[PDB]
Symmetry: C3
Subunit: 337 residues, 3 copies
């Protein structure tokens, strides 16, 4: 494909070069599958063994790791090889330098589209819409009236941006997601449900990522807010009026119900469920499949689940669980006449 | 921005007016963010403090509440404020009565399309399809052969309606949703899976709402049926042959497995799992992340799950959970001699 | 509509014909809803009483069942009726015969499209793409650059295939699915998330089926692999680098996190969550909603969850549960001296 010298690659991550700076490199690769023209990284000493044996031509390493790799000659020394790696993934990433407006697209005459944005085939952009510089909007995607997309944004295919959602800069949203959809609002009467119109929108901050097949609903009256730097994997449900604080990560298949606020720097593992009208403090980490039903006021790590059981062990465990309510537990832990 | 007089708004909800019936209002708003030109609603006495402090022009309240609101002058007195509010959200909802067939739609000559319907751009409609009066079918959506949509329906973009699904009146289905999809039929032989074709369909009642990123699979032989007034949030799995009773509500991320039947007036909270070939009786609420593996014969509220735990308390809780099988429980409660 | 003779059908399943060979049949159907021109099947004695009352014209039964069915004259005998039924579903399943490329498609000239393939309306096919013989790409779907799709594949609408994904033969992918989208790769620095570009791809073997609304992310450096035979239901998350063994079945709504390997012939029930960097061995069955956090290294059936509880009972249970950690359980069953 296309080649990079080691010296350039070390300079790019602002690291100390060791070994022949003029060596060619085609790609990044894992320890196991790397070859000579491949640059790789050693993430802590758990991976020393795979490193020692790797056929990779150079190594992104910590200084205390370089000492444990005499077998090897060419290095890039940095304090955080993982972040240096992360930077360089983009150098090797094959880039979409595409620009201009595909003639099958339907852009309402009132919309402002930067001359360096890309609008895909069969994209539809409505009244008062704005798409910023170097923004990429892929094919079939639709932008409803009054939707604004900032700079350096990536929006893939079959994404719906509606409810006049407003997106800042460096926002990326993957295929088949819905931003700004009509949330689940229903009033009961005569044992039937009256639909509640949904009159709010969505604010989406800078540097925010959203996976595929996600549903981010627009607020019922105010806004659903995804603060700066929030990251969200595939198949997440974010209900109306959810407010997600800065740099919070939400793993695949989490569900955050209506009007809940999640603090800054929170980490939710796969398939957590958070009920409605709750606050979750800053710096809360929830492990896989946590069911949150009350508030969380203290920072920390929280969990729910029974863990894994062999099936028979399980069957008997849950029979004994069913019996616990009839057992006075603490009133025997200290019962001795 | 179109205005409405306070006396009309009170008439529109069958409500008693108090205050200057000629006052102008742009929109509904929340207690916290309402301005002078905004109508709002106080839902029970838990919100009085937010209400008193609010800058809302007028108030939707009950008689028992207007009393505890001396601070305010113009009200609309109704018996269920939530429902009066629900009605008025539509009056402020950005109403779209577009009509006709966009010129980039691909429609089979054999399909019957009501003159009052709207077929959007890039819409594809197959043989013997019927789209009834006043139905909106948004851009990019597809209707396979023998699919029928009734009157006054809203079908959004990137919706697949297949397997000759039959949708009645006032049915609304949101984006990235698959109605009628081939269900999960696989017979085992020689340690491989023989795919079973699926020859059924889907009956979707009047007044049924389906969210985004949902999958409603057709029957293996008969029909998957969603009865009148069923409402379904985003990210729901309805498997082949599931039958859902009238006005049952199904929250986000629920999965209902093949051939199961859920009664009338049921409520399923977020992320429930209902296993195959079961009956759930009329009038059953399940709470969040509930796991149902047997029939539910009696009405009532049901639950599964541990609570949330701080992580160390979780780890030690589950260590002790694992020991529970080997521990005589009912043979020590009656053991006092 | 379209008619078949009983003897043809008997022959199609390598089956002993009993009764009038020349009888006409339109369709399969259930024991409950079959009419004279419907063929049906009796699956063991459990369904015998239903069969006795069926208006079905003919019955796919096994010898020791014909036995208990004197009420009925027309049969097809076979050793496994379910598999016989499955073979015949395809005979009645409406054939999708179409060939060619619709004019509303956009296909880059450097793409190779078989003359026996169908490219549906509005499809977008990128550079260096390959589409095999008899493959169907339904309307609206997109293939990005370097995507390859084998022979006899079916790929429904609003599918995104990207990340240079490679698909073998007889792969079928349902609607709203995203194959090979950027995985959840993020580095932490200064309490921010730096995005990690995702450089691998996806290999999908022969005879793989994927449901609707699924996300199958590309690998970080190496590939995400679905081996031959793998079947995956609707709404599943398969993270970057997940490796899934031949003939494994993944039920609706499962999540497998990054870098997890899953052996051959596994069965995961609906809504399981498997954590990252784990091994599950060949022949493992998980029951609905299991949470795997450690490697499972022996074949067997595994589970997690509490039972379903009536709600009051549930609340007392979790209170007792919470008390469990403070109670020594093994030190009291062995307390008698």
């Amino acid at each position: 494909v296309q080649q990079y010298r080691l010296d350039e690659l070390a300079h790019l991550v602002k690291g100390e070069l060791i070994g022949e700076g003029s060596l060619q490199f085609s790609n990044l690769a894992s320890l196991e599958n790397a070859e000579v023209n491949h640059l790789t990284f050693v993430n802590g000493e758990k991976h020393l063994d795979q490193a020692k044996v790797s056929r990779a031509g150079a190594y992104i390493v910590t200084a205390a790791l370089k000492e444990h790799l005499p077998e090897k000659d060419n290095f890039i020394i940095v304090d955080n090889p993982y972040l240096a790696f992360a930077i360089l993934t983009h150098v090797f990433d094959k880039k979409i330098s595409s620009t201009g407006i595909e003639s099958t697209a339907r852009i309402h005459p009132s919309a402002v589209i930067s001359e360096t944005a890309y609008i895909g085939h069969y994209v539809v952009i409505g009244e008062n819409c704005v798409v910023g510089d170097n923004t990429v909007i892929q094919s079939h995607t639709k932008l409803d009236d009054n939707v604004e997309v900032g700079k350096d944004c990536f929006i893939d295919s079959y994404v719906t941006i509606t409810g006049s959602s407003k997106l800042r800069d460096r926002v990326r949203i993957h295929s088949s997601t819905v931003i700004g959809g009509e949330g689940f609002g229903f009033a009961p009467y005569q044992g039937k449900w009256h639909r509640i119109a949904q009159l709010g929108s969505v604010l989406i901050g800078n540097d925010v990522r959203i996976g595929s097949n996600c549903s981010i609903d627009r607020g019922a009256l105010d806004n659903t807010i995804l603060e700066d730097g929030v990251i969200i994997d595939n198949l997440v449900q974010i209900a109306h009026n959810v407010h997600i604080g800065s740099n919070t990560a939400i793993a695949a298949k989490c569900g955050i119900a209506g009007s809940t606020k999640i603090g800054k720097n929170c980490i939710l593992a796969g398939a957590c469920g958070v009920a409605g009208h709750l606050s979750i403090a800053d710096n809360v980490t929830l492990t896989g499949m946590s069911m949150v039903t009350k508030n969380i006021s203290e920072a920390g790590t929280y969990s729910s689940g029974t863990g894994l059981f062999e099936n028979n062990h399980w069957k008997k465990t849950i029979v004994r669980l069913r019996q616990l309510a009839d057992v006075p537990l603490t009133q025997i832990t200290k019962r001795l006449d």
